[PDB]
Design an enzyme around this catalytic site. Structure first.
Site, PDB file in Angstrom:
ATOM      1  CE  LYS B  52      -2.086  -2.518  -0.538  1.00 17.81           C
ATOM      2  NZ  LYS B  52      -2.345  -4.005  -0.717  1.00 17.81           N
ATOM      3  N   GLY B 147      -0.301 -18.802   9.513  1.00 17.25           N
ATOM      4  CA  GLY B 147      -0.376 -17.948   8.350  1.00 17.25           C
ATOM      5  C   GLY B 147      -0.163 -18.641   7.024  1.00 17.25           C
ATOM      6  N   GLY B 183       0.528 -14.579 -12.895  1.00 23.03           N
ATOM      7  CA  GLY B 183      -0.632 -14.439 -12.043  1.00 23.03           C
ATOM      8  C   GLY B 183      -1.169 -13.019 -12.048  1.00 23.03           C
ATOM      9  N   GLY B 188      -0.601  -9.684  -7.795  1.00 15.64           N
ATOM     10  CA  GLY B 188       0.097  -9.484  -9.051  1.00 15.64           C
ATOM     11  C   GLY B 188      -0.275  -8.172  -9.713  1.00 15.64           C
ATOM     12  CG  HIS B 450     -23.886  17.312  -3.088  1.00 13.57           C
ATOM     13  ND1 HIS B 450     -23.932  16.510  -4.208  1.00 13.57           N
ATOM     14  CD2 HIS B 450     -23.604  18.561  -3.532  1.00 13.57           C
ATOM     15  CE1 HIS B 450     -23.694  17.244  -5.281  1.00 13.57           C
ATOM     16  NE2 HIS B 450     -23.499  18.493  -4.898  1.00 13.57           N
TER      17      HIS B 450
END
Ligand code: FAD
Ligand code: FAD
Lengths: 471, 472
Positions: B52, B147, B183, B188, B450
């Protein structure tokens, strides 16, 4: 002479949405707009252009400042092309106002260009600019005439050097020094735009807090703290006695403490006046109908948005409640749905507010101050964005989420967000309040990781369980 | 000497560390065992967080280096990539967050044991340190949160130099001129997009016929692929990799065929990223002696309370069935531990969202159209494009749409699919709606601020319920 089932006066968010909704419900609908374009204040001189400049100026600040350098994005020289920045804003406004015309055509809404006056209980007369008049014989009249800037007495706006929000959105050059009268939502957003672009900005506010009415005080103080570190300067509890133009072209603004004394004068190249906005009803024909405005100039209505005259309705900025675009849109929908036999109820407590600075501010429900005044016992949950995974990953960690929950039932009473993504996040909070969710209910929702919304989840857990996982 | 505990957690990833913290908060005496040098498992160290970080930074690089900033009046003489500095920002975030877990363990009185953990007894776990020293835990409950690991491609050996896993791709020393990704799943696509933005020439090879992995709605997938291709991402779907070879010049030749057969060809690259999947990690855990046998895919079978065959031994997270996601592992960890204390234990994997942090983002929760057809559920569709949303248009960031699937008779929201800006945050509003059985009409009646991107979510629900939206 046109006859219609519903004639809407005004094409702002309340009017244009109400007109579309009425047409979709089978009504024969006419919408009257005096200005050259549809969309009212919000599209033409409000939400849209300001959000465009907030977005564009924020990225300028990122490029011109240290942010991009810290991420390995190196720029030799960063310079501002204001004309092109304003062009991007203009492209957005024109695309959206044109979109409304397309929507009116799509839904068979009849667009009448003129100044609308209620000449009869069942007729509206639209006077075109050349003087031509168009008469509409109508079963129902929906007033959505909106608002105008509240003038400051003794200070005359020329949209050149003494500007309203409209002028501040179209300055031809970055002012070296700018003063803002009013630290409400509009004032803070616009000052921040020009502050990011290089201006020296001071905001003068009669009240003791920033952000307008209804904002949570802890949130307000933290918001002010962050804005001040950015370079935004504030004079609160300060009154403006007058402003005078000078031969050099600069403006002297004379101020005093709200309690009294401490006279002072400050100078600027541009003075922005945003003490508020007020309901606009001039030359509408309310005088003859016997419809009396409330002292603040708003049209009184019942739960169905009916005036005293049962077939004449009013919605939006022109009536009581928060003067916001989404508020006017919803009032227009439920009012028109009420015309079709629907039940009509809205809780202004579930109407959210957003401030599109960076960090953003957003809240819905009640503030701590409202709860104390109403005598409701509550508990507090807080989670800081410094502890949120996505905020840390983005190196954007200002602010927090504050949740107010009912002591026994755990019901969410208010949600207050200061930090990144507050404006979008408040809509999750809005969904929760509308259906009376508890703090635990939100805490048990699986929120995607890593997202900013996890701060909202953990704050609710803190309000509910007493402790968060990641703080 | 030996330690006694009520709960012994093996693994400190999102499942293990959150479960250990929660168990302690419920009064259990908690021990967490981690073989690695830092806490946080895959997500913090080589997963969610660094990817990220690079997605965020490479996206900003793309806006500045490309035309976006210029279109807004942000004019720059030259934009240069300091890859070392960008990698520094990623590393700083990982360091702060992994350290933060250590503070939380200390804050919540979790005992942190650094070593490789093996279940030596029904009520005993032995942690073997690198030096060879062992610390023994006699424990009432054992929670397995060991994991996942990279799924290797047989015959193509990863060296984290020119043939890399997600881990190597997150720390490349230079932008490769040409990159091949095996992939086209979430990982990927995200990593390929990062390097494509930074200047690499990127191709993704996928045996399947769609991008984005399994569970993604096909219409969303095809639109997502279309947009990525315009960005410069190249895809070869329905394509099989027969082999890959390093070359004397240091480049890589990748030999491929159509899955059906034929169209054999070779494509060359500087870096090859192997992203065919991730698989449950249970090595040397002691399951065979306990008689706990894995399913065909290597996962630990568990009941609704996350109990193995041995009732006092539980398993959660990537090692068990369900979406291999961090928030999934966290939730399983909390409720499993809550179950240890007699609490109710329930999770609905249908309400677990999925996010792809490209730009535009992809996010969904609930059912796809393909899933509803397979299950024989009749539905109605509502769509709203971001090109018609005020905030997206104001930002000049208008790709994609919101798609809502509603049950024909009940109007219940069955699935929400978002392709576009802010999809990752928006799906959390959708997850709240699904968890409590909201209808399409219910969401449409919520007052959305809005201008916000979320108004597209409202209008899409209105379209599904009422048949028409306001602004499209
Ligand atoms: C700078 C700025 C930023 C803002 N940002 C936001 C924001 O981010 N979010 C938000 O929610 N709100 C925002 N607002 C407020 C928002 O614009 C208003 O709340 C909203 O526009 C009110 O809608 P309305 O339809 O009630 O009135 P208006 O939008 O004012 O619409 C009234 C329309 O009716 C026309 N009209 C009036 N009288 C007549 C007549 N007699 N005959 C014919 N036509 C007539 C007017 O010409 C106008 O087009 C902002 C306002 C400003 C000034
Ligand atoms: C590149 C990448 C990006 C990702 N992005 C996302 C994303 O954006 N969102 C998302 O939700 N998920 C994402 N994931 C997936 C996410 O990392 C996993 O779903 C999550 O880590 C699973 O948590 P876990 O606790 O079940 O397992 P893990 O995170 O793998 O934790 C297992 C831990 O147990 C330790 N361990 C194993 N066996 C033993 C033993 N015998 N003794 C002691 N310790 C042991 C391991 O060393 C490790 O620390 C991503 C993954 C990758 C690879």
């Amino acid at each position: 002479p046109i006859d219609a089932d519903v004639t809407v006066i005004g094409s702002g968010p309340g009017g244009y949405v109400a007109a579309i909704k009425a047409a979709q419900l089978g009504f024969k609908t006419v919408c009257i707009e005096k200005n050259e374009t549809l969309g009212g204040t919000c599209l033409n001189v409000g939400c849209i252009p300001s959000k465009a400049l907030l977005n564009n100026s924020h990225y300028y600040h990122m490029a011109h400042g240290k942010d991009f350098a810290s991420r390995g994005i190196e720029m030799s020289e960063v310079r501002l092309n204001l004309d092109k920045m304003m062009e991007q804003k203009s492209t957005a406004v024109k695309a959206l106002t044109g979109g409304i015309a397309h929507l009116f055509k799509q839904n068979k809404v009849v667009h009448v260009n003129g100044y609308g006056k209620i000449t009869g209980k069942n007729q509206v007369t639209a006077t075109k600019a050349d003087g031509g008049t168009q008469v509409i014989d109508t079963k129902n009249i929906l007033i959505a005439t909106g608002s105008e800037v509240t003038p400051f007495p003794g200070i005359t706006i020329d949209e050149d050097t003494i500007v309203s929000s409209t002028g501040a959105l179209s300055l031809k050059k970055v002012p070296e020094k700018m003063v803002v009268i009013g630290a409400g939502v509009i004032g803070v957003e616009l000052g921040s735009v020009w502050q990011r672009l290089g201006a020296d900005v001071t905001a003068v506010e009669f009240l003791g807090h920033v952000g307008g009415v209804g904002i949570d005080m802890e949130i307000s103080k933290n918001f002010q703290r962050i804005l001040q570190k950015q370079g935004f300067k504030f004079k609160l509890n300060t009154k403006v006695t007058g402003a005078t133009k000078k031969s050099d072209g600069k403006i002297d603004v004379s101020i005093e403490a709200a309690s009294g004394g401490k006279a002072e004068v400050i100078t600027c190249d541009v003075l922005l006046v945003c003490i508020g906005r007020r309901p606009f009803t001039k030359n509408l024909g309310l005088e003859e109908l016997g419809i009396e405005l409330d002292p603040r100039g708003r049209i009184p209505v019942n739960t169905r948005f009916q005036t005293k005259i049962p077939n004449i309705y009013a919605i939006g900025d022109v009536v009581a409640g928060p003067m916001l675009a989404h508020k006017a849109e919803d009032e227009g929908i439920i009012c028109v749905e009420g015309m079709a036999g629907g039940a009509v109820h809205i809780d202004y407590n579930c109407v959210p507010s957003v401030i599109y600075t960076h960090p953003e501010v957003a809240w819905v429900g009640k503030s701590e101050e409202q709860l104390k005044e109403e005598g409701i016992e509550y508990k507090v949950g807080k989670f800081p964005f410094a502890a949120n995974s996505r905020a840390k990953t983005n190196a954007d960690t200002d602010g927090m989420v504050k949740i107010l929950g009912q002591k026994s039932t755990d019901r969410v009473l208010g949600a207050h967000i200061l930090g990144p993504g507050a404006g979008e996040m408040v809509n999750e909070a809005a969904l929760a309040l509308e259906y009376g969710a508890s703090c635990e209910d939100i805490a048990r929702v699986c929120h995607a990781h890593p997202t900013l919304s996890e701060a909202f989840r953990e704050a609710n857990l803190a309000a509910s369980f007493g402790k968060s996982i990641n703080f």
